[PDB]
Symmetry: D2
Subunit: 359 residues, 4 copies
């Protein structure tokens, strides 16, 4: 049985979620994407955006356009791999999307505008059953990180969920292995060296609520607060108040790295941490946590679908010799791709669990 | 008396226009910037924006803030070398700007949003007598380029003028010299290799009226139509229909170059054009047309206040030997800086011809 | 009978040529790459370089390494699809390369250092039979552009040959169709907006032969002369003395675009020209000249294996209305990828004509 | 008596050292720059390089050229406001530099190639008395960081010294304040987000000794080991074995940031650290350590003469609330400009102490 999905906000993630939703061969069989929504209804423009991606290259699937019925002005329907996706009109208010009529039960909320759970329940007002916010939520939405706490998904209780941030999805798996392996975490500070994003500015512009983020994005190292590490304390509750961090947004369009400096609860070694991470990645963290022992740079993690790619060499080489407690872990992530894949994993995990809890 | 100016839209152009008139030593003396305007009235944010510039460096003048009335919550007044500039609230419609009470005679229309002459006529309904549109104007606003036609300005018929584009300001002075020095232009195509701008996107984003323009700006060569070459045909009407061209937006935040290819109206040589261009730049085009014969690159034109800096070595080395008609001229421009100074130049020229009247 | 090939210089073009021939399924099937050469013979390093490409992503074939002899310390042999490629020690002088001992009959000369015919001829003395110089050659190497004049190749007479430059492989196809289709080129000036390259500098650095080219490559627009349009003259003899041009090296790591302004040798129209290039594209330039009518930016041309991808929209939109003689044509090229495919194409053609010649 | 200085390696640091000199009014008074050496003696080209700077703007001071003698073919002498500087030809071996003949007493060793003490001592064979290696040195060169341990300079003992790395110059002043004030450093790991440099490559190139550093610099985040934090342990011996760190080389041509994470040796708070860094910056660390509490991005530190500009807002905002031991300090540095000033200060200090010893 195909699950009926709707993507509200067809941007980097709204669209990579779709590409991710296709790359896995899921479109039309396991997942029917019933409707995607951006500003316009222009299937030709939507399709163009899908076809060509500056970072992720050309979309593997042929995208065509058609009309829902001849009484429509322009093609308002994408056709991906024979499957038809209607382009619905954006709404200032999620409550005004016609989800029920469409028969969409799962809304991927990827606008960046409705991270407030109250707003994101708008979709449930429009007829959906579940929303997955492609961002940290606010207002008590259950935050779920695949491979970390996603099994805490309660079908009967969790209707509007957050898939956390890309950064949390990179960090949390690392911290989860640290915790699960018994290294523990006294405290940690993470810095993400972060590719610039849609909210940033080509040239110095107005950014009233973040002055640095208003600065020319591709020519600056631009510091920023981030709630990603604090957010881990909500996904891995034993790390609450133990982690924070920041971001430096740097002139790359995609791919980021977590630089986690933490203190372990008891004596260990970076070697043990590195052996754990590598085993975790092979096993109970498989598909979520990867590692490389290669000399990779950011471009090499483009289209990596893991949420965290432990950089073994950068980690092993850049720690204190003989150190027992105070460690740095480097883990990469394609902030766009890894995350978008996780959204799909989440949606899929929720659907199997919604199936189980029904029949 | 003090030339009473107001800048509607404090951004790259609004600020650099301000930074240009300050730097030309005009603030307070020749020119009274009574008010500026953007989204917020947060003079502290304006001050930070003026203080720090990714391309143009730190502002040479100290900028403090104050309240205009002790009754106001946050500082809404800028102080620049002891000159007070009120930060007034943004309007969706220029007609609702308080230029009347404020005493603003000259408005600089640098929002990007009221380039429609009629729209920009709002400042007039708001209290102002003159408006300089810091972009190409639609709607029959008189386009003026300093050094080329700025003497065609008529105080009695021209109240809403365009300062044209930064690209036209680069190109028109070249074409003006070409025409005036007797070489003439039969036809010409121009390509501007252009630094990306505010309207562009850090990452592939929605740009429905300019699909290529929607694509990640700092990792792409992005072709674009430009009206700049056609616009010269307004500024130098003998060239109407004779010129067009395009833009390639490239990963630099400022500085552009005109690469004009044209066919002269008489047999000439590149050496003739070269010498003419150098002559004109020393004489009647002083301050507007500059030239270099050094091995310059885009960074070297940062903070150059000329409209057009003719590249002698690039032109002379890249033309057909012994050619009589078919030439490429290479001319640089700091698209933010030169233009901004020209805006100030235009206002200074408008004020002089508005006064002395009519004497 | 598999073509015995050695690649001298395994950088951007050395590797991309190798990747091009692998992509085309030629390795060990149609072409025996016996040896590759660079500053080292560390096959592990070669493998890493092949495996990860900033621009071109992950190589589609697995690379392994092994040892030519079990004693030989660090791995010196690449293995791709069962095929053993020796990493031979670089020589300051090509005649010292053991080509005759390796059975290499075709050398791709991709160092950038043996571009002079007499220098590349050293390969022949090292025992090779044919040399394709992966750049313009001096000293009277026959220049061959696939799809334009490669059929001029003369096995008995042409032993050291040039595949021209990426830029000439981009322009020649356009000029070729112009001349072949009866438009003609009276005069032509080209600008290529060029990606920065290996010869450029990350930060302002010493570049005695090219002052501009020493300037920080990723933050500057950097004018250059080019012999690319002038060189179309030896490939299309009728265009000799009629064409020249320049480059602006802009901050993208790969993909460039030809901006050609020409005067036709008869009244025509950009629609005629547009249609002619599309026809050529679909026919006798198939695989060499491509075209788009989409809103493509440079990233979209990454891994395009055509020489020239004519930009229909940018051309159609940026020409003088109703103009009959004076035209601009816009054509993209992945300077790395398209050219690399041509190198392989050329060797294959040459090998086919070498085979035919004597029997 | 101005000190006779030679600059061996007139690159980024070679040249910014020279700018520091002139800007500070030290030329011809404190310091005679007798010669600068790079790949040739072409003063014209030297002057072009000094004149135009992608990151630091146009040299404010006029540079002219003459010949040392009429026998010389081309200009070999820079003239900067009366001050004459001979361009001498690069020697593969410093021992062949004509220092003795020239009367050059102090050599700024800024090639990046004679960083081994024994190799830098070549300048001493060449007739110099003192070498400041403008990088970390190997082979036992005393490392000196201005404002931290520079008073440890011993005229009779230290003839070839290291002024450390740009990074250690950022870190050491912070760590110094932390140690001096009794906050202490139990363990520390730093990361530097680091502008690309001259050793990096524009496109994926060969870098056998640093695979990642071979990768395209301006399109990647490129991890790297660094000796910078470890090197603090030579400069502040109490921190030996207690600090290491790494680098992420990111796509900016200048300005870097240290992200220090450490455990204090006693209970503190980041407000107390913050307070102490500011107080030191105004007092005993003045000119070496600076601070900002503004919303600065890297562009804003371009041309900042300090070794370390502590980012009070990035620090204060991104630490654990109520944390007593485990902290992050964000400090910026213009890796080129700050450091080059430091080089100058070092030579001046060494000169001071040499006059006071040899009396
Ligand atoms: N991009 C990343 O690396 C990344 C990673 C993880 C999470 N996220 C989160 O994903 C969300 C979106 O991120 P993005 O990077 O894709 O940004 P984006 O701006 O590319 O995507 C948002 C899209 O929503 C569209 N939109 C705006 N208003 C809308 C409306 N009312 N209805 C429908 N569509 C509307 C926009 O036009 C845009 O195309 C944000 O919350 C962001 O924090 C982003
Ligand atoms: N930037 C350049 O290179 C350049 C050069 C020449 C001409 N221009 C023209 O100048 C105009 C602005 O260019 P820019 O680069 O400064 O763009 P910008 O976006 O940097 O500046 C525009 C500013 O207007 C403000 N604004 C938006 N709506 C407003 C409103 N309703 N009321 C008041 N303020 C408002 C925005 O906050 C922004 O800061 C455009 O028309 C552009 O074509 C730009
Ligand atoms: N890069 C492009 O876009 C492009 C396109 C068309 C043609 N070309 C031409 O191809 C040639 C190579 O350019 P590239 O971009 O690959 O530069 P590159 O520097 O990336 O590749 C050159 C390789 O040759 C190696 N090399 C140097 N000396 C050698 C020697 N003696 N023996 C063996 N190897 C040696 C270098 O280590 C390097 O890896 C140049 O002539 C260039 O003009 C380049
Ligand atoms: N760039 C920075 O931010 C920075 C900061 C602090 C220290 N350093 C150190 O400064 C030194 C120079 O760095 P840079 O960034 O200026 O590099 P650079 O490449 O810009 O400067 C090195 C200069 O030395 C010249 N040179 C090479 N061989 C020479 C020789 N045999 N004799 C004379 N000159 C020769 C090169 O042409 C080049 O101009 C390096 O050791 C580097 O680690 C660099």
């Amino acid at each position: 049985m195909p699950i009926k999905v709707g993507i509200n906000g067809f941007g980097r993630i709204g669209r990579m979620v779709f590409q991710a939703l296709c790359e896995d061969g899921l479109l039309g069989t396991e997942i029917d994407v019933v409707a995607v929504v951006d500003m316009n209804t222009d299937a030709e423009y939507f399709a163009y955006q899908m076809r060509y991606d500056t970072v992720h290259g050309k979309f593997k699937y042929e995208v065509t356009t058609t009309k829902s019925s001849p009484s429509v002005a322009k093609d308002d329907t994408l056709v991906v791999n024979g499957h038809r996706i209607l382009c619905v009109k954006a709404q200032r208010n999620p409550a005004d999307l016609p989800w029920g009529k469409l028969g969409v039960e799962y809304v991927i909320e990827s606008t960046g505008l409705f991270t407030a759970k109250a707003a994101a329940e708008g979709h449930l007002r429009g007829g959906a059953r579940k929303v997955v916010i492609s961002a940290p939520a606010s207002g008590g939405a259950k935050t779920l990180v695949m491979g970390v706490n996603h099994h805490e998904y309660n079908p009967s209780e969790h209707h509007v969920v957050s898939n956390a941030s890309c950064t949390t999805n990179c960090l949390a798996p690392i911290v989860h292995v640290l915790v699960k392996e018994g290294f523990g975490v006294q405290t940690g500070l993470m810095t993400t060296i972060h590719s610039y994003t849609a909210t940033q500015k080509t040239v110095d512009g107005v950014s009233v609520k973040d002055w640095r983020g208003g600065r020319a994005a591709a020519v600056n190292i631009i510091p920023s607060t981030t709630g990603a590490a604090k957010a881990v304390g909500m996904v891995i509750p034993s790390t609450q108040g133990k982690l924070t961090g920041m971001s430096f947004r740097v002139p790359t369009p995609d791919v980021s790295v977590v630089d986690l400096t933490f203190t372990a609860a008891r004596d260990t070694s970076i070697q043990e941490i590195d052996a754990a991470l590598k085993r975790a990645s092979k096993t109970y963290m498989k598909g979520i946590l990867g590692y490389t022992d290669e000399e990779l740079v950011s471009a090499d993690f483009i289209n990596d679908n893991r949420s965290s790619i432990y950089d073994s060499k950068a980690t092993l080489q850049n720690n204190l010799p003989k150190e027992r407690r105070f460690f740095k872990i480097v883990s990469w992530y394609d902030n766009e791709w890894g995350y978008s894949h996780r959204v799909v994993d989440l949606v899929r995990h929720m659907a199997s669990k919604d199936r189980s809890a029904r029949l």
